[model samples]
Target: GLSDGEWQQVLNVWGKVEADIAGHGQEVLIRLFTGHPETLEKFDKFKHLKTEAEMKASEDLKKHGTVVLTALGGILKKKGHHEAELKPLAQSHATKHKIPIKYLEFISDAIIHVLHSKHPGDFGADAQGAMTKALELFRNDIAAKYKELGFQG
Candidate 1:
């Protein structure tokens, strides 16, 4: 539902975000965990990282973060028409991983924070608004998929 201008705005900032997916993704994850320490309980791969240094040096965290941000980039390219791609992902997270929707919200917030921190000038209001709307659409789509799968995620 993005206007052409808004879509372009999102892609413009996303290009910068995509340029350092691993680094940006790791920062987002770190921000999320640091801001909400209890959320660390959701990640089997990273819950063992009790210290900030441990998390900062975690290969597993970096790998998973990269994968997640890569997926986000792909979904962004699709311009919110990503149900086919997201359905299985939603199902897995909702059922197998048993992730709550709040965690998704947390990650979204973390991503926005990292974007602003890393690209203060580029991710201005227009770009940030578009990105936020895009993320909301993605979250709603996943929530719908979770409903269909009988998982209250």
Candidate 2:
């Protein structure tokens, strides 16, 4: 999904932000909830959170955010070799969360969007675009879960 240059650029860009993984994950929730408040409805535990602070205080966000960032860390670390690792996760979300595929897309976008919003100085369109493409391998795996459960509209 990426050329060698794009692939390396993604890894290098990721290196710049992994230390702040939770913050990046937080940025995703803020962006997702703010930009698309409708998504908040899906998170029954935190759906009542009306402000960013409320989101910050939620244990659900902390735990799931850590899971996301940790999962993301390894996915990025393995140099995109996540086909096997990604399936069980997708399966769990498909069954338990019943999250829409669009949200999956949003989660994918949230990764890139968070990096761009948080680290604009180093992560420009070049880096953002590369990461976007690099994540396709991960995104597609999740998408297959939606398809598997006949969740596609």
Candidate 3:
């Protein structure tokens, strides 16, 4: 739970992250979350992040998780309508980040899969199953990257 001030900060961070992702795309989101190795190293080496920038970045990433998940839910409402289009956008972002293209593809696949599974009446069971597998693979990749960055949430 957050105090009122903390919640306000979370809202502000969430708004910034959403606007950045919408305007600049997922690569910017990835950079915001995964870049800044020095910050991560400070956290890891000292077991404490003393700088305000480092602490704010970590908090912003957590807020981004909430915003993205909510936005993704809205996107899922459309079933397969946006999946194909969204993939290229994700791939472009991944390329910009120097993350492996395959990893980006996996994440795109997962998004499609989760949407399909949740809307199986529209996409069918087989498609849903395939997407489920893709989602699992993507989750693993994302978890690894976040872990490497020392993100707990």
Candidate 4:
């Protein structure tokens, strides 16, 4: 849970960095692929583009990155019933695509890396806690659904 201050700080930083949506999305995807090359195997469209440069420049990256980041946008909007309100992309991954939860964890990791290095002022300890809590909410929801589906994922 974010204290009002923490959420404020997150929103403050989000506005600055995300004001340039394409650049930030590219950065997050580039960082994700850079650190976790294996995760790219899951993206049929993205798997062919091996280099970070390839990912950053292509419209494919923009498309898929937009989907996931947009989901994050929904949560960050801080609307009521966030977890309940939905994750269409997440639900698709969990059920339709049968993605393992471990892979999903990688996305949050990439986001954290982006936040710390690219947008340092966005988060203090409390804000980090809140950020972790927010990611945890989504991560756990998907993991639980994975279990309910009774697959190895």
By descending lDDT, how would the candidates be arranged? 1, 2, 4, 3
What overall lDDT, based on C-alpha atoms, would model 1 receive against the true structure? 0.86
lDDT winner between 1 and 3, please give it.
1
- Which regions in candidate 3 have their CA more than 4 angstroms from the true location? 1-57, 83-88, 104-153
| lDDT, candidate 4, 84-143, per-residue tens | 545565577777665777876787887777878776775567766766666777677666
**Residue-pair clashes per candidate, as listed?**
0, 0, 1, 0
Can you write out model 3's per-residue Cα lDDT over 27-146, one digit (the tens) per residue?
Answer: 333343244333234223223545545544555444544555565434433333444534544544344433443444444554444334434555545444444543454444444454
TM-score (all chains, Cα) for each model: 0.93, 0.85, 0.31, 0.81
Error of 2 at 28 (Å): 1.0
Q: Which residue segments of model 2 deviate by more than 4 Å?
A: 57-60
Colliding pairs, model 4: none
Which of 2 and 3 is the better model by TM-score? 2
Root-mean-square deviation per candidate: 1.4, 2.1, 15.0, 2.5
User: Candidate 2, residues 1-153: lDDT per residue as tens digits?
Assistant: 677888888888877667776767777777788778888897887788999888877777866777777887777666767777777888877788777777867777777777877777878778888888877767777787779887734
Specify the highest-TM-score model's number: 1
Q: Please provide, for model 1 over 121-140, each residue's C-alpha lDDT reduced to its tens digit, 9 standing for 90 to 100.
A: 76788789998988898889
- Candidate 3 residue pairs that clash: 113-131
